[PDB]
Enzyme design. Structure first.
Site, mmCIF file in Angstrom:
data_model
loop_
_atom_site.group_PDB
_atom_site.id
_atom_site.type_symbol
_atom_site.label_atom_id
_atom_site.label_comp_id
_atom_site.label_asym_id
_atom_site.label_seq_id
_atom_site.Cartn_x
_atom_site.Cartn_y
_atom_site.Cartn_z
ATOM 1 N N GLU A 109 -61.106 -24.021 -25.306
ATOM 2 C CA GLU A 109 -62.276 -24.483 -24.559
ATOM 3 C C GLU A 109 -62.987 -23.317 -23.833
ATOM 4 O O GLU A 109 -62.363 -22.579 -23.083
ATOM 5 C CB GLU A 109 -61.829 -25.589 -23.573
ATOM 6 C CG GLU A 109 -62.809 -26.028 -22.484
ATOM 7 C CD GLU A 109 -62.155 -26.857 -21.381
ATOM 8 O OE1 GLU A 109 -62.589 -27.984 -21.131
ATOM 9 O OE2 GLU A 109 -61.200 -26.398 -20.734
ATOM 10 N N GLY A 161 -56.393 -22.493 -15.585
ATOM 11 C CA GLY A 161 -57.271 -21.982 -16.625
ATOM 12 C C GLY A 161 -57.758 -23.006 -17.642
ATOM 13 O O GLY A 161 -57.324 -24.170 -17.670
ATOM 14 N N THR A 162 -58.688 -22.557 -18.477
ATOM 15 C CA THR A 162 -59.203 -23.290 -19.619
ATOM 16 C C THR A 162 -58.129 -23.806 -20.577
ATOM 17 O O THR A 162 -57.046 -23.227 -20.703
ATOM 18 C CB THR A 162 -60.082 -22.344 -20.388
ATOM 19 O OG1 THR A 162 -61.392 -22.463 -19.857
ATOM 20 C CG2 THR A 162 -60.039 -22.612 -21.903
ATOM 21 N N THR A 163 -58.420 -24.898 -21.261
ATOM 22 C CA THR A 163 -57.402 -25.484 -22.104
ATOM 23 C C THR A 163 -57.484 -24.904 -23.502
ATOM 24 O O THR A 163 -58.556 -24.559 -23.998
ATOM 25 C CB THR A 163 -57.315 -27.049 -22.002
ATOM 26 O OG1 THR A 163 -56.754 -27.614 -23.205
ATOM 27 C CG2 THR A 163 -58.663 -27.733 -21.595
ATOM 28 N N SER A 187 -54.575 -19.032 -21.899
ATOM 29 C CA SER A 187 -55.255 -19.700 -20.796
ATOM 30 C C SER A 187 -54.761 -19.041 -19.553
ATOM 31 O O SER A 187 -53.553 -18.904 -19.356
ATOM 32 C CB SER A 187 -54.871 -21.190 -20.698
ATOM 33 O OG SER A 187 -55.060 -21.908 -21.920
#
Lengths: 250, 222, 243, 196, 198, 244, 204, 244, 233
Positions: H47, H30-32, H75
């Site tokens: 993010e 996943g996104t940070t 995330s």
């Protein structure tokens, strides 16, 4: 969440075996030896306290348990399964009997109740059988003294003397040699102590041997006086000292 | 009903009369108002006789199981907390008024319980229709630091006040003594100051007095 | 045929693999701990290891206050440890309410051991991968150590230890007790009993500890508390002044 | 019943009489109506004995569980737990509860919970059947930030008036003093307060 | 209440039951048959609360008919009457109790005796030579106590009922529009259609 | 989830048999033999206790013969513990019937009920069936002396003589040969023993390995009596029929 | 109104020398209307005798209930129930219905087959046990019975003397109660035999 | 054997729960996202990959508020994060209902922890596919937590999770060494923006939007508030200026 | 790999995937195409309807939820019936209880949470339908994309269904133009119909084949079908 295991975990294999019960008996075989001997005026049940550490305090773990003031139990197999069974046994003696008839159940009946609890763990959804075999010794006014064995399947049999667990075949042979219908309680205590000596490698003393009897009423162990018809319990656990006294006379 | 509880220097005593009535009629002249919850915890009860006996044995039975589960002697505060919680749940409909006493590892105790589930603590206590007669005697003779024999006497005297003065009470005095060192002693019919005098005449009948129509043997066997 | 390894049913040997495996998880944190009994106190010592510099050290603990009187140290993953702590706290609170006195250490142990035994028998519950060491100064029994495992087993202990290097600590203590001939540490102050515990951990593990490498809990009459960094430091200074 | 709780300079004092009657008969002359639900959170009970006891017993249970998980609860939290029980079961209880506690940050606080289940934070609070007779007196003599002995005195005079007039009050005056110092139990006998 | 009368003679049970159905101020019907047949040799009459009366009787009839098929057998009057008692005794502590009183008249083919059972709404069963529910006994029992013999023929039975009904039509304030009469014997259940001017 | 571990105790084979019933019958086939014989004036139940020991108490035992009613009894082949569950409910059924109708329960009605319970464990619930076969011996005043049998399938049948458990093939052949309709209880007893004696897997057939019961019409009465033979009484009847 | 007074009826029990006796009237009424002269109120389960007064429908039910429970008892216990035990069973059975009780006054009488001790007990509608040593009374003429018994009774009577006493107690009590009578019946109970005698009394 | 990884509550022979380990893979994918504790509060940033011009900017908000004083960011599987935040909301309402005071952060942490752990106890549920970073200000300080799919959680000085987690963790560690006396709220917001940009390197193929929230005693009054307009732009700039 | 872990939704793959969900997502890709797009004043759904035979009717793809909200579907149509039916109730509840038109953002949050429950529990299945939701609320015109994974996204325009990538790029390219078509219904629709024409390949969009819906400032959500779309081909 939610128990979605509402189907039997014990079923019949093509040969007719009930796998889970067989397997539980095998857990029992690996268990430390226990035994019981019926005399004319008493019963004795005995086993080895086999501590997991010498840092453990083995008087804190009891393998021989009072179920009613006249009935006691010992086991071979899985310790924690025994402990919960004793809880359930004690309770059911009240809810299924004492709260109804005002007296403690007779031995065969209470055994029967324990057997039922065991049988059900062999058929109900989402449980495994209990990994123990029990020896239940006790007294009641109308049947005298009796000794019973209960196996994982829920089957129970009355015995004059028997042993279960690790050295049970040797010990049942030893017991057939020494048993007769004329033994007094002390003689049976003596035979128990001898029989057990074969199973124990390590120290064999009053601190490593648990042993109880169903004998006479112990009015000193009742806690109150004034009701002539209440005479005291017949169940007495022997003390470390009492056991040792009988070993020098061995 | 007259019931009392008196503390002494090393324990606690409870007593009761032995009359049981339905309305103005005496049903039992020798009934037991003293109840065992465990060996060393006894209870005296007033109100509805089936309720005091039933509530005593229900809690008693659980106390026994609790004791076995915990490897410990039962405590009075346990019996008290169990009784009150049950009584409360049933909003006064279980008509048990109780004096609960005993000795355990923590000492000697004396409490009362009302049907609605309130509890009290005391050195001396009474309940029942003889409550006031008894308490008059207690307020009169109680002192701190009674001896066992003083306490039995005071207790026994309070029940007597009830026997004589309250129509709700009579016949005998039952006592139970719970001392910290020792076994509980239950003294059923400790006093029997109401023996019936010999009748003036015997009423034994000449045999054959009663007209019989038919006689038969009843079968007990199978 | 090979599903007897996934749920808590018997293997043809009579074993319960899921329970054995659950024991294995109790070592996952690589923390050791030990408990000892004083004249009138009980002490648990456990290694504290904070590898991440991003962690707030004050929130890293495996010692729990279960009741005013009972304390509990866990060996195993923190999520199962906290699950067990919450339950034991609820069970300790309820007991007090129902029966009018404080739940004894051994009793709580039996209760937690029974719950664990159930997961052993019912298929839908997994065992917790934790070992629970419970400590107090019981009002009837005095200083108490009772420890439960994923099998549902429990017993009382003179003293005990648990973790990857369980055995070394155990033999160290066993040896002490053969010499001392009694079943406790003969010291009137708990400060000295903590001191003993830390000492014997050092001798068994062969390691020196700083104030942040340890975690200490103490039980006395009517209180169980845990020591601060600074209270441990004070104990560390004292040990070093006899060498 | 005559009960009150007063906050002062150093914390809070709870006070009560010791009489419980059933009708005109005094069933208990030595009752303790000052009940502990936490080390430094106490209550005074009025209304039904069985109700107030049962409630107090549950609150003790909730705050013992709270403490285990979240450390020491505030006095406001204790009052809230009492209120939840009282308000939510207003049809079945008869409980008039004064909650009084000492907190290190907050000093002495007093919460009164009358029959309906409402909460009221106050500098002092009076309740129970004897309280009606001392509304005038209390309102004229209470001042903020009194000393321990001034507060003890004010409680003592108040309750002795309430006891003088209410047949439902009497016996001994009990007090519990709640400060940073700990917890102090006072008792005052009739021979002393009757002649004030 | 409606009239519910029963008499057991040598070889039969006779049930007599009033024909009127009154709702408040008007007699709605004067030919009502207050009876269900439970099995070939068992008849039940009934009186009480307006709806429950027939609802209960048809409920019993249905159960007995089910039993008869399941077992291909006819329960003894005593067995039918015990069932019926249990049902009423259940009903008495339930939320809304059946207020129905019944007579059960049966011919026991295995004993060769006729049998008459009286059960009230509380489930109070008694076995009797003659019975009634409600006020009916108050007017008729002294006649039956007087004239009744256990060895009476069916013909003698009907004559004794005729007397009972006469007393009822003289002294009881309600017009019950006469009775339908039924006989239960070794041959089963038949109705006497000539009781109006018998 | 849980689906993975479900044995599916209640499904048909491609041939249309019920696995679990078949396997449970397979279990029963290894159980000590039980025999019922019906006579004009009585019923006999005989069962063979499989493997014993000198130390086994025989005086305080009854593992295969159970009393249901004053007028009904059963002999068990299969799992004892399973059998007690069933026996207990059957004892309850009999008393509900007595309470409802003030008449003892006709034998078929009790056998059908038990059989129904077994059939349920065959069709719904995903539990294993009971590993039990019964022989029912009883009396009522409709069909007189009756003898029935039920197995894990929940099927029941009526019989003049029948065996369940081990070696039933052999036992049935022997029963068919020597059984006659005009038999009296005393002959029936003998037939039962003979048959067990020829079909045992033991050296001999001693008293300690047998349970025995009869339902007779007590010859000085006019009504029915059930006798579960005492260890002595088996020892006696074993000599009268000449097997000492 | 009062379910204990609808049907009428009495039961009395007495202890003597190695014997007990239990007695009842035979009436079943519906208020003022007498209904049956054959309503026996005494039953037995093996050697234990139970008499029941009060609401007839409950009397019948309870008998059927105790027959059920003692039957199951005998099967499981392999022995007949004793009076002490049965009494406890009556007690717990009654209390189970504490807030919806049966309207009855039960009376237990028997001899303990092991000890040979004579035993009687009485219960209220909610199961409170009264184990008198002498006599127990129940029903709509219980006041009358208490008066008769308190004068006529003496300890240790012989079966045939106890018979005269209990009979006279019963008959003269019933004769002062509108709702009792219409026949009477007396059981004399010993260790090994039990005799049942129907009395002759007025029918009004 | 194998198959230890096919079912949720199952211990492998080495004592692991593989399904939980697989849930962790979903998180890593996943996104940070990060949280930074400051001297009187906490800052959260995430993010937000822009898959296309078509996504309305500022609009698909990812950070969530619990009660009035707690912020959460996660995330992994986003819907899982939502579910967890819903529960957190019930859980905090319940606490406020009964105790009057808003839930303390450590108390709140544990509530989420116990619920997440619960979902590794049974095979009828899947574990959570998120790590959640969350925190706030209560009666005695500011608290930052991160909570794993295993139910594991601790207090953090700063915390990071998602694809860009090593860069973020490295950046975070720097800050701890260089400011041992504490960072300020304005300071932490700028720094946060930086670390997201720096973490954006490992996913540099798509364009991204930045989202920050904070909860500071002095700056927001102990309430959780999003960072908008001028203060947001200022932090975007500080990061653009330090990317070069 | 995939073999053993795709049995149900309660199982993760070793790379951290949920196959059952991705299998559900695949029912969407095989669905008939549909497009949504908005300005600041209106939002538009355009959908291609699919039939079975020349004998069959064209299956509807647009469902109205309230006066100010509606959606188009791609995938399992019954699932859309369930979800749109839930959404109808959520709108209704807002009105009856709070006298408030439910925000399009919130409706998206509710659908995400409903869908998500069916991806963590044993025995259930994910929804196999994708949804495009348009509405006009108190913050103006809005368009959402719902995926059975529970991801709901707010967009200026988008497309889902077979060959939806055509329409998606066209929209990506036309962004600055259509976003500005305020106060002009017919012109926004024409922009939609052109974008949907980018996803055709089969044939040309006919009168009883094409479905359009609109909602905006002074326009309640309305669906055009039959000769009422003639003016747009």
């Amino acid at each position: 969440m939610t128990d979605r295991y509402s189907f039997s975990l014990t079923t019949f294999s093509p040969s007719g075996k009930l796998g889970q019960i067989d397997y539980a008996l095998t857990a029992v075989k690996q268990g430390v030896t226990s035994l019981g001997i019926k005399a004319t005026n008493g019963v004795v049940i005995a086993t080895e306290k086999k501590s997991s550490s010498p840092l453990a305090m083995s008087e804190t773990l009891s393998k021989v348990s009072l179920l009613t003031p006249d009935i006691g139990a010992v086991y071979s197999g899985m310790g924690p399964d025994y402990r919960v069974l004793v809880d359930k046994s004690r309770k059911v003696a009240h809810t299924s009997y004492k709260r109804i008839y005002g007296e403690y159940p007779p031995t065969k009946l209470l055994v029967s109740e324990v057997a039922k609890i065991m049988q059900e763990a062999t058929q109900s959804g989402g449980v495994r059988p209990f990994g123990v075999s029990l020896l239940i010794a006790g007294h009641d006014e109308f049947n005298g003294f009796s000794l019973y064995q209960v196996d994982p399947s829920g089957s129970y049999f009355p015995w004059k003397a028997t042993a279960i667990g690790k050295g049970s075949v040797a010990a049942k042979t030893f017991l057939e040699k020494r048993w007769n219908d004329e033994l007094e309680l002390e003689d049976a205590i003596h035979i128990a102590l001898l029989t057990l000596k074969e199973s124990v490698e390590g120290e064999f003393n009053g601190d490593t041997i648990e042993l109880a009897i169903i004998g006479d009423e112990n009015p000193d162990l009742l806690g109150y006086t004034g009701i002539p018809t209440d005479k005291g319990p017949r169940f007495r656990k022997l003390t470390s000292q009492e056991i040792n006294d009988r070993l020098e006379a061995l | 009903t007259t019931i009392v509880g008196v503390k002494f220097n090393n324990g606690v005593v409870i007593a009761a009369d032995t009359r049981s009535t339905q309305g103005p009629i005496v049903a039992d002249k020798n009934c037991a108002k003293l109840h065992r919850i465990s060996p060393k915890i006894w209870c005296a009860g007033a109100g509805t006789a089936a309720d005091t006996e039933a509530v005593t044995q229900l809690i008693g039975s659980n106390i026994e199981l609790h004791s076995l589960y915990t490897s410990r002697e039962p405590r009075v505060v346990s019996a008290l907390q169990m009784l009150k919680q049950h009584l409360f749940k049933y909003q006064g409909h279980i008509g048990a008024y109780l004096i609960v006493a005993g000795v355990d590892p923590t000492g000697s105790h004396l409490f009362s319980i009302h049907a609605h589930g309130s509890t009290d603590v005391g050195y001396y206590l009474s309940l029942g229709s003889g409550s006031l007669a008894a308490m008059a005697v207690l307020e009169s003779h109680w002192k701190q630091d009674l001896t066992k024999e003083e306490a039995i006497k005071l207790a026994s005297d309070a029940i007597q006040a009830g026997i004589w003065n309250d129509l709700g009470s009579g016949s005998n005095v039952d006592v139970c003594v719970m001392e910290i060192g020792k076994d509980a002693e239950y003294l059923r019919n400790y006093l029997t100051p109401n023996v019936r005098e010999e009748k003036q005449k015997s009423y034994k009948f000449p045999r054959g007095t009663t007209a019989v129509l038919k006689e038969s043997i009843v079968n007990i066997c199978d | 045929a090979g599903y007897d390894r996934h749920i808590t049913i018997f293997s043809p040997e009579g074993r319960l693999y899921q329970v054995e495996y659950a024991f294995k998880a109790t070592n996952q944190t690589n923390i050791n701990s030990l408990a000892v009994r004083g004249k009138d106190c009980t002490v648990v010592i456990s290694q504290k290891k904070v590898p991440d510099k991003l962690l707030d050290p004050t929130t890293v603990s495996y010692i729990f206050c279960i009741s005013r009187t009972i304390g509990m140290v866990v060996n195993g993953p923190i999520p199962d440890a906290r699950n067990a702590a919450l339950r034991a706290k609820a069970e300790a609170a309820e007991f007090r309410y129902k029966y009018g006195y404080d739940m004894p250490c051994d009793v709580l142990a039996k209760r937690m051991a029974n719950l664990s035994q159930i997961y052993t028998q019912r298929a839908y519950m997994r065992p917790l991968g934790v070992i629970l060491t419970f400590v107090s100064v019981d009002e009837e029994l005095g200083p108490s150590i009772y420890k439960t495992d994923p099998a549902g087993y429990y017993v009382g202990y003179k003293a005990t230890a648990t973790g990857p290097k369980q055995q070394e600590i155990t033999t160290n203590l066993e040896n002490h007790f053969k010499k001392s001939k009694i079943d406790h540490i003969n010291e009137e102050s708990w400060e000295k009993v903590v001191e003993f515990a830390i000492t014997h951990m050092i001798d068994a593990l062969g390691t020196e500890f700083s104030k942040n490498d340890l975690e200490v809990g103490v039980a006395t009459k009517d209180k169980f508390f845990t020591l601060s960094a600074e209270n441990i430091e004070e104990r560390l200074v004292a040990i070093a002044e006899q060498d | 019943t005559s009960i009150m709780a007063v906050t002062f300079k150093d914390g809070v004092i709870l006070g009560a009489d010791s009489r419980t009657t059933t009708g005109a008969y005094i069933a208990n002359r030595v009752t303790d109506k000052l009940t502990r639900v936490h080390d430094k959170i106490w209550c005074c009970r009025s209304g039904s004995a069985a109700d107030t006891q049962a409630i107090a017993d549950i609150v003790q249970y909730h705050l013992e569980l709270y403490t285990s998980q979240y450390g020491t609860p505030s006095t406001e939290t204790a009052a809230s737990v009492f209120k939840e029980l009282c308000y939510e079961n207003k049809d079945n209880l008869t409980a008039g509860i004064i909650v009084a506690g000492y907190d290190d940050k907050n000093k002495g606080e007093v919460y009164t919970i009358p029959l309906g289940g409402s909460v009221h934070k106050l500098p002092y609070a009076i309740a129970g059947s004897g309280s009606t007779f001392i509304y005038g007196y209390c309102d004229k003599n209470f001042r903020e930030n009194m000393s321990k002995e001034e507060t003890v005195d004010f409680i003592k005079h108040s309750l002795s008036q309430a006891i003088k007039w209410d047949g439902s009050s009497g016996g001994v005056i009990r007090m519990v003093v709640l400060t940073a110092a700990g917890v102090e139990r006072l008792i005052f006998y009739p021979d002393e307060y009757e002649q004030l | 209440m409606d009239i519910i009368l029963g008499i057991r003679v040598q070889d039969s049970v006779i049930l007599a039951s009033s024909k009127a159905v009154t709702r408040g101020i008007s007699v709605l019907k004067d030919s009502d048959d207050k009876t269900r047949q439970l099995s070939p040799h068992t008849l039940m009459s009934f009186a009480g609360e307006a709806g429950d009366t027939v609802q209960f009787a048809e409920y019993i009839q249905a159960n007995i008919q089910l039993y008869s098929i399941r077992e291909d057998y006819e329960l003894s009057p005593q067995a039918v009457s015990s069932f019926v008692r249990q049902e009423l005794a259940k009903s008495i502590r339930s939320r809304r109790p059946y207020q129905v009183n019944v007579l059960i008249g049966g011919y026991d083919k295995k004993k060769n005796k006729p049998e008459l059972y009286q059960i009230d709404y509380l489930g109070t069963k008694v076995e009797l030579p003659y019975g009634a529910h409600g006020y009916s006994g108050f007017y008729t029992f002294s006649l039956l106590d007087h004239h009744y013999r256990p060895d009476m023929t069916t013909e003698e039975g009907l004559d004794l009922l005729k007397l009972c009904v006469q007393e009822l039509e003289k002294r009881m304030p309600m017009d019950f529009k006469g009775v339908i009469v039924k006989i239960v014997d070794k041959d089963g259940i038949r109705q006497v259609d000539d009781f109006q001017a018998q | 989830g849980s689906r993975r571990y479900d044995s599916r105790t209640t499904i048909f084979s491609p041939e249309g048999r019920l696995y679990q019933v078949e396997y449970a019958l397979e279990s029963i086939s290894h159980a000590g033999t039980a025999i019922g014989i019906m006579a004009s004036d009585g019923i006999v139940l005989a069962a063979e206790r499989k493997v014993t020991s000198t130390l086994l108490e025989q005086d305080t035992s009854t593992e295969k013969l159970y009393k249901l009613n004053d007028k009904i009894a059963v002999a068990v082949a299969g799992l004892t513990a399973d059998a007690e569950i069933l026996i207990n409910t059957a004892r309850i059924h009999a008393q509900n019937y007595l309470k409802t109708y003030n008449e003892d329960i006709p034998v078929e009605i009790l056998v059908r009920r038990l059989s129904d319970i077994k059939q349920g464990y065959t069709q719904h619930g995903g539990l294993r069936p009971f590993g039990v076969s019964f022989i029912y011996a009883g009396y009522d005043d409709r069909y007189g002396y009756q003898l029935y049998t039920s197995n894990p399938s929940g099927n029941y049948t009526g019989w003049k003589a029948i065996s369940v458990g081990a070696n039933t093939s052999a036992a049935q052949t022997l029963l068919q040969m020597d059984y006659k309709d005009d038999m009296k209880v005393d002959d029936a007893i003998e037939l039962a023993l003979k048959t067990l004696s020829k079909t045992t897997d033991s050296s001999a057939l001693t008293y300690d390995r047998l349970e025995f019961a009869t339902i007779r019409k007590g010859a000085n009465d006019g009504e029915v009596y059930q006798k579960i033979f005492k260890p002595q009484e088996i020892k006696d009847i074993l000599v009268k029929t000449g097997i000492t | 109104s009062d379910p204990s007074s609808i049907n009428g009826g009495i039961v009395v029990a007495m202890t003597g020398k190695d014997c007990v006796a239990i007695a009842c009237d035979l009436r079943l009424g519906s208020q003022s209307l007498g209904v049956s002269n054959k309503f026996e109120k005494i039953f037995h389960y093996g050697h234990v005798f139970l008499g029941i007064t009060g609401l007839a429908t409950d009397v019948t039910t309870l008998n059927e209930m105790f027959r059920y429970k003692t039957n199951l008892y005998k099967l499981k216990e392999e022995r007949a129930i004793e009076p002490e035990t049965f009494t406890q069973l009556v007690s717990s059975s009654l209390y189970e219905r504490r807030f919806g009780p049966y309207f009855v006054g039960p009376v237990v009488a028997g001899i303990n087959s092991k000890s040979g001790k004579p035993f009687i007990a009485g219960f209220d509608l909610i199961g409170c046990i009264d184990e008198a040593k002498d006599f127990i009374v129940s029903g709509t003429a219980s006041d009358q019975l208490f008066g008769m018994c308190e004068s006529l009774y003496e300890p240790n009577l012989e079966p045939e003397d106890l018979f005269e006493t209990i009979s006279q107690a019963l008959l003269n009590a019933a004769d002062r109660d509108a709702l009792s009578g219409w026949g009477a019946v007396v059981y004399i109970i010993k260790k090994d035999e039990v005799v049942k005698r129907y009395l002759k009394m007025r029918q009004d | 054997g194998t198959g230890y990884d096919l079912s949720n509550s199952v211990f492998s022979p080495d004592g692991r729960n593989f399904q939980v380990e697989y849930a962790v893979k979903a998180v890593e994918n996943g996104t940070t996202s990060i949280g930074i504790k400051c001297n009187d509060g906490v800052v959260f940033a995430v993010e937000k990959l822009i898959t296309s011009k078509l996504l309305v900017p500022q609009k698909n908000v990812k950070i969530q508020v619990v009660d009035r004083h707690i912020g959460c960011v996660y995330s992994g599987l986003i819907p899982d994060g939502r579910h967890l935040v819903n529960r957190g909301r019930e859980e905090a309402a319940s606490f406020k209902k009964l105790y009057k005071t808003p839930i303390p952060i450590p108390a709140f942490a544990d509530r989420l922890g116990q619920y997440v752990q619960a979902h590794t106890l049974y095979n009828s549920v899947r574990p959570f596919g998120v790590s959640t970073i969350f925190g706030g200000v209560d009666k005695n300080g500011a608290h930052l937590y991160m909570l794993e799919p295993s139910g594991s959680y601790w207090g953090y000085k700063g915390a990071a999770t998602g694809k860009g987690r090593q860069s973020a963790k490295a950046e975070l560690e720097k800050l701890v060494d260089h400011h041992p006396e504490g960072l300020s709220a304005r300071e932490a917001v700028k720094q946060a923006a930086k670390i997201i940009y720096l973490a954006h390197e490992d996913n540099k193929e798509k364009d991204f939007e930045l989202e920050i929230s904070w909860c500071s005693l002095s700056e927001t009054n102990g309430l959780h508030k999003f960072v908008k307009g001028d203060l947001l732009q200022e932090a975007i700039d500080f990061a653009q200026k330090e990317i070069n | 790999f995939r073999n053993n872990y795709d049995g149900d939704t309660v199982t993760f793959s070793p790379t951290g995937r949920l196959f059952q969900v991705e299998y559900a997502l695949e029912a969407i890709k095989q669905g008939s195409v549909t497009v949504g797009l908005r300005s600041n004043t209106h939002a538009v759904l355009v959908a291609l309807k699919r039939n079975a035979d020349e004998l069959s009717s064209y299956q509807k793809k647009i469902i109205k939820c309230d006066e100010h909200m509606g959606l188009s579907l791609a995938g399992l149509a019954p699932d859309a019936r369930v979800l749109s039916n839930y959404l109808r109730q959520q709108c209704n509840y807002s009105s009856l209880v709070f006298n408030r038109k439910l925000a399009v953002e919130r409706a998206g949050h509710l659908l995400c949470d409903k869908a998500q429950k069916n991806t963590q529990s044993y025995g259930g299945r994910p929804y196999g339908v994708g949804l495009l939701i348009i509405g006009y609320d108190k913050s103006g015109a809005h368009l959402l994309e719902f995926q059975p994974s529970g991801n709901v996204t707010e967009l200026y325009g988008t497309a889902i269904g077979a060959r939806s990538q055509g329409a998606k790029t066209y929209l990506e390219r036309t962004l600055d133009t259509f976003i500005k078509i305020d106060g002009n219904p017919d012109e926004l629709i024409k922009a939609g119909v052109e974008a949907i024409s980018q996803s055709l390949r089969d044939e040309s969009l006919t009168v009883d084949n094409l479905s359009i819906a609109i909602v905006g400032k002074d326009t309640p959500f309305t669906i055009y079908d039959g000769e009422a779309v003639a003016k747009y081909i």
